[PDB]
Amino acid sequence: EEKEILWNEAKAFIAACYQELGKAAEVKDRLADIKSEIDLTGSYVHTKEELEHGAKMAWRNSNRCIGRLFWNSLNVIDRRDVRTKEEVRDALFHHIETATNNGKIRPTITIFPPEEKGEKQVEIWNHQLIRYAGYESDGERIGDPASCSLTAACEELGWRGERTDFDLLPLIFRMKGDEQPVWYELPRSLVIEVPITHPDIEAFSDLELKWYGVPIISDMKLEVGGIHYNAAPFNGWYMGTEIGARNLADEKRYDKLKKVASVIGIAADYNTDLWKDQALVELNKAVLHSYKKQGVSIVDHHTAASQFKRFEEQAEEAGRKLTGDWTWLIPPISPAATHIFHRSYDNSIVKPNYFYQDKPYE
Amino acid sequence: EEKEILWNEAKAFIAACYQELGKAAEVKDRLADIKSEIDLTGSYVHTKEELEHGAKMAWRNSNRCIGRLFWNSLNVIDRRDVRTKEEVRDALFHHIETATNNGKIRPTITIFPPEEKGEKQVEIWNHQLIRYAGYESDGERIGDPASCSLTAACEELGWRGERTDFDLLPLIFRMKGDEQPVWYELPRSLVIEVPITHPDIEAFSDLELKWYGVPIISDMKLEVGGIHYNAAPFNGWYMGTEIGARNLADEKRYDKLKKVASVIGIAADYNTDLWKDQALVELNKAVLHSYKKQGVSIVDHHTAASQFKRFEEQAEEAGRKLTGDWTWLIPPISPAATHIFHRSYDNSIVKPNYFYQDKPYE
Ligand code: HEM
Ligand code: HEM
Ligand SMILES: Nc1ccc2ccc(CCNCCCc3cccc(F)c3)cc2n1
Ligand SMILES: Nc1ccc2ccc(CCNCCCc3cccc(F)c3)cc2n1
Ligand SMILES: C[C@H](O)[C@H](O)[C@H]1CNc2nc(N)[nH]c(=O)c2N1
Ligand SMILES: C[C@H](O)[C@H](O)[C@H]1CNc2nc(N)[nH]c(=O)c2N1
Ligand SMILES: [Cl-]
Ligand SMILES: [Cl-]
């Protein structure tokens, strides 16, 4: 059944891919080559072109992503050649550097060798390449709660966090054949962070908030034409609400709204005062302001939604069906102020695509 | 097939209803009585108890409603006895008075005679008993755009609006047998309106905004045990976001955010300033403030969500399955600040319930 599933996904992918790339007549020969390779090796190897385009289609198909207008400009790095843990490390280090691009973020994906027969060649443990540790001990809560289990897993491996609220986690990943993952501290020179300040309210600095510049999601599986690239970190730039409305605002994350209300000088006593709403708005304004001031790419939810509307228009005029997840596309602040809120989306899954996969710890 | 559909809905309703009311042993006899009545008349008549409880269950089952905690305290008025257009008018007038209750709003439903064989006895044309007219002529836009087609329909019937932005529409409904609906101007003494002012910003009055006190939805069908009550207006009190975030804020409604930004003294030039978000928050604070100050019942979205959480807890501990529409339950401002955003809901349709029905005009 395995080979059959593979062959079928391969037929659909190559057809679609070669048609978009204006290479329709090359399908028959390529598919034959593929058919033999599968019969003879149990799998097949993508050309540079297939891989690059498949990663772009995968982005284009991510129902939950509001930033898809720019799918065709994704920078794809092919690292299917790595074999050593040192090579993986340096490739991950490089990804951070070139994606960050001194603040002018380039949307980038680095692709590692794919699974063979469900056997991972490289297994990344980080949720993001850059993320803060979290600690929960005897009622004492430090840093990012979403990182608690990974942090505890790293502290099994010989690492120890300084237990500030903003400890950078080390890169952690396992190689095929090894029993335990390895870990490498991030070079601080590679990581841009942004201090959160407010355009009008000087006291906002008293909160001593900051966040990292580039979200590099590193735990999802890229699937292209039946080939499972479990290790393929990618990044865009942030939409401000991700930081200001969720990461810093959620009760199960940094939970800062009460502190925000205090520094902006409003009471946090009565629901009818809408103090949480006001606090959210000022925190989100501060995040956008701080990133711009630091010269680090970011988008506000309004601009982002107008871009996504263009993505919609582009999809129709190219004759492609649009898919989306309304519940994730709407932004967590002022959603009714965007067009997204007022239309519906088909949530069907189209491949290529990025998928959740089981965590190697927990 | 009609009688069969009816009988089946009746069996399920009476079973459930009599069980909740601790009257389980009275089911067999009641169902027999019902079975004969259907065979002999083509339909059946609900007892006072069945009707009252069925209207409450219908509210309890409205997936899209965040205010369901108070389903069991619904005030049900039985007007199945009306036969004249004067009687309907006075019943609608009465509903407004007793629901308004001098500002201490009582959630109320008035139930009129149900359809016979799809034949409506009374057919209400208003979306709400109290709502503002809308006009769109030669690029000139006045009042509430959502009311444009009903307003044009009324102005066919001999009525004429003053073309202020806040013209009260007359009640309009048709009686079985009549070809045209009739219309009656609302007595101004019965309608509470609230001027919108802001707690801190005196200039907010310059906008001369106002809204009506009681939303009385009058175009939905109540379905109870196979009986179709097409005419059954009901009301709660407002959640502030309904007014501040949608009615006054939407581009296809009153579209006031640019004006709001101006009076609160912020520029409306750059998306990154989040001026729409700030404007939404101040407008929503003003709406809550104005209603409280006027002594008219209203709830903020936070309190409302905490109440709905209690509804959820109550549903489980009573062994009832919970149903809901996540896309409508989340409030249109700061949705991620409520628990609703972070859980999922089953959107299955359970009867009794309230349903959309086709409009008699357009
Ligand atoms: C260029 C700037 C980009 C922006 C502003 C953007 C924006 C977003 C946002 C706000 C989310 C929701 C995040 C959350 O609520 O947790 C999202 C989801 C997602 N984005 Fe993007 N994105 C961008 C680029 C990319 C790129 C380059 C890829 C991959 C090539 C990608 C793939 C996805 C996927 C797979 C999800 C859903 C993840 C999940 O289900 O957990 N996006 N995007
Ligand atoms: C007591 C105060 C109440 C509050 C605060 C409340 C709140 C809400 C809100 C905010 C909505 C969404 C409105 C929209 O976005 O258009 C809603 C929907 C709804 N509510 Fe309630 N509600 C209340 C009482 C009631 C009552 C008394 C009933 C009927 C007996 C009811 C039945 C419904 C129904 C049927 C909907 C959905 C209508 C549709 O699909 O268009 N609610 N409620
Ligand atoms: N700005 C961007 C760009 C690309 C992105 C790509 C992916 C994401 C998702 C980040 N958070 C995903 C959380 C996944 C998850 C789902 C359920 C439970 C859980 F613990 C974690 C955000 C992005 N933001
Ligand atoms: N505060 C309350 C209480 C009860 C309510 C009961 C119902 C409602 C819904 C009011 N707006 C419904 C709009 C229905 C609709 C749907 C699609 C298209 C359309 F034109 C109209 C609001 C309520 N608000
Ligand atoms: C397509 C989408 O379901 C539609 O825009 C809904 C979204 N959720 C909503 N929620 C509420 N309360 N009211 C609405 O009118 C809508 N509109
Ligand atoms: C149950 C619900 O789908 C869940 O809370 C979702 C809602 N929409 C979301 N949307 C985004 N962008 N991010 C999220 O984490 C979530 N959480
Ligand atoms: Cl993030
Ligand atoms: Cl309304």
| Amino acid identity at B162 | E
* Per-residue tokens: B87: 């009687």
* Per-residue tokens: B216: 């009385």
| Amino acid identity at B85 | K
Please state, in angstroms and as integers, the Cα–Cα distance from residue B89 to each residue in A150, A293, B171, B243, following that order. 67, 63, 8, 27
A281 shares contact with chain B (CB less than 8 Å): yes
* Per-residue tokens: B86: 């004067």
Residue of minimum CA distance from atom 1 in ligand 2: B236
Pocket test for ligand 1, best of A56, A59, A64, A109 (most atoms within 8 A of CB): A64
Nearest to B111 by CA among B267, B281, B229, B268: B229
DSSP, collapsed to helix, strand or coil, labels residue A32 as helix
Positions of B marked active-site: 65, 68, 237, 242
Q: Is the CB of A129 under 6 A from ligand 1?
A: no
Please state, in angstroms and as integers, the Cα–Cα distance from residue A70 to each residue in A213, A253, A347, following that order. 19, 29, 20
Structure-token match 């009545």, residue found: B37
- Assess contact for A266 and A275: CB atoms under 8 A: yes
The CATH superfamily label for domain B193-215+238-303 reads Nitric Oxide Synthase; Chain A, domain 3 (3.90.1230.10)
Inter-chain contact A284–B274, Cβ cutoff 8 Å? yes
A273 shares contact with chain B (CB less than 8 Å): yes
B253 shares contact with chain A (CB less than 8 Å): no
Positions of A marked active-site: 65, 68, 237, 242
For chain B, the 3-state helix, strand and coil shares in percent, each to the nearest 5, are 45, 15, 40
| Amino acid identity at A233 | P
Question: DSSP labels for B236-273?
Answer: --EEHHIIIIIITT-TTTT--HHHHHHHTT---S-GGG
Residues B95, B97: Cα–Cα separation, whole Å:
5
Please state, in angstroms and as integers, the Cα–Cα distance from residue B141 to each residue in A176, B134, B147, B195, B205, following that order. 68, 8, 12, 21, 22
Q: Which uninterrupted H or E stretch holds B298?
A: strand B298-299
Packing angle, helices A48-60 and A2-20, rounded to 10: 90
Q: Within 10 A of B80 (CB to CB), how many other CB atoms are there? A: 14
- Assess contact for A312 and A328: CB atoms under 8 A: no
A1-80+107-117+221-235+305-329 and A193-215+238-303 share one CATH topology?
no
Inter-chain contact A277–B334, Cβ cutoff 8 Å? yes
In chain A, the DSSP E strands lie at 75-78, 108-111, 122-124, 134-137, 140-143, 171-175, 182-184, 193-195, 210-212, 216-217, 221-224, 227-229, 234-235, 238-239, 298-299, 353-355
Resolution in A: 2.0
Nearest to B217 by CA among B301, B145, B109: B109
**B153-171: b or e for each residue (b if 16 or more CB lie within 10 Å)?**
bbeeeebebeeebbbbbbb
Per DSSP bridges, beta strands B122-124 and B171-175 are: antiparallel
Residues B347, B62: Cα–Cα separation, whole Å:
10
Q: Please identify, in words, the CATH class of the domain defined by B1-80+107-117+221-235+305-329.
A: alpha beta
Q: How far is CA B66 from the centre of its chain?
A: 12
Inter-chain contact B274–A292, Cβ cutoff 8 Å? no
Residues B13, B192: Cα–Cα separation, whole Å:
37
Method: X-ray
Residues A168, B272: Cα–Cα separation, whole Å:
28
- Assess contact for A331 and A64: CB atoms under 8 A: no
Residues A356, B93: Cα–Cα separation, whole Å:
57
Nearest to B302 by CA among B278, B337, B270, B269: B337
- Assess contact for B241 and B211: CB atoms under 8 A: no
DSSP, collapsed to helix, strand or coil, labels residue A304 as helix
Burial class (CB in 10 A: 0-12, 13-18, 19+), B317: exposed
Alpha-carbon dihedral angle through residues B328, B329, B332, B334, given to the nearest 10 degrees: -150
Q: Which uninterrupted H or E stretch holds B75?
A: strand B75-78
- Assess contact for A284 and B274: CB atoms under 8 A: yes
Nearest to B353 by CA among B77, B14, B54: B54
Packing angle, helices A275-293 and B275-293, rounded to 10: 170
The alpha carbon of B339 and the centre of ligand 8 are apart by a number of angstroms equal to 24
Sorted by sequence, the CB contacts under 8 Å of residue B153 that are 6+ apart come out as: B125, B172, B361, B362
Residues listed for chain B: 362
Alpha helices in B199-349 (DSSP H): 240-241, 257-263, 275-293, 301-317, 326-329
- Assess contact for A219 and A212: CB atoms under 8 A: no
Nearest to A249 by CA among A326, A145, A339: A145
Sorted by sequence, the CB contacts under 8 Å of residue A344 that are 6+ apart come out as: A326
What is the CA angle B265-B270-B272, rounded to 5? 105
- Assess contact for A135 and A246: CB atoms under 8 A: no
Residues A58, A54: Cα–Cα separation, whole Å:
6
Residues B52, A1: Cα–Cα separation, whole Å:
59
Burial class (CB in 10 A: 0-12, 13-18, 19+), A103: middle
Nearest to B209 by CA among B198, B217, B221: B198
Q: Is the CB of B326 under 6 A from ligand 5?
A: no
* Architecture of domain B81-106+121-192+356-360 in this structure: Alpha-Beta Complex (3.90)
Residues listed for chain A: 362
Kindly list the domain boundaries of chain B, sorted by start residue: 1-80+107-117+221-235+305-329, 81-106+121-192+356-360, 193-215+238-303
- Assess contact for B130 and B218: CB atoms under 8 A: no
Residues A31, A11: Cα–Cα separation, whole Å:
7
Inter-chain contact A285–B303, Cβ cutoff 8 Å? no
The alpha carbon of A177 and the centre of ligand 2 are apart by a number of angstroms equal to 59
What is the CA angle B185-B190-B192, rounded to 5? 115
Sorted by sequence, the CB contacts under 8 Å of residue A219 that are 6+ apart come out as: A124, A125, A126, A127, A128, A357, A359
- Assess contact for A123 and A173: CB atoms under 8 A: yes
Structure-token match 């609608």, residue found: B92
Burial class (CB in 10 A: 0-12, 13-18, 19+), B296: buried
* Bridge partner list, A217: A128, A234
Residue of minimum CA distance from atom 12 in ligand 6: A328
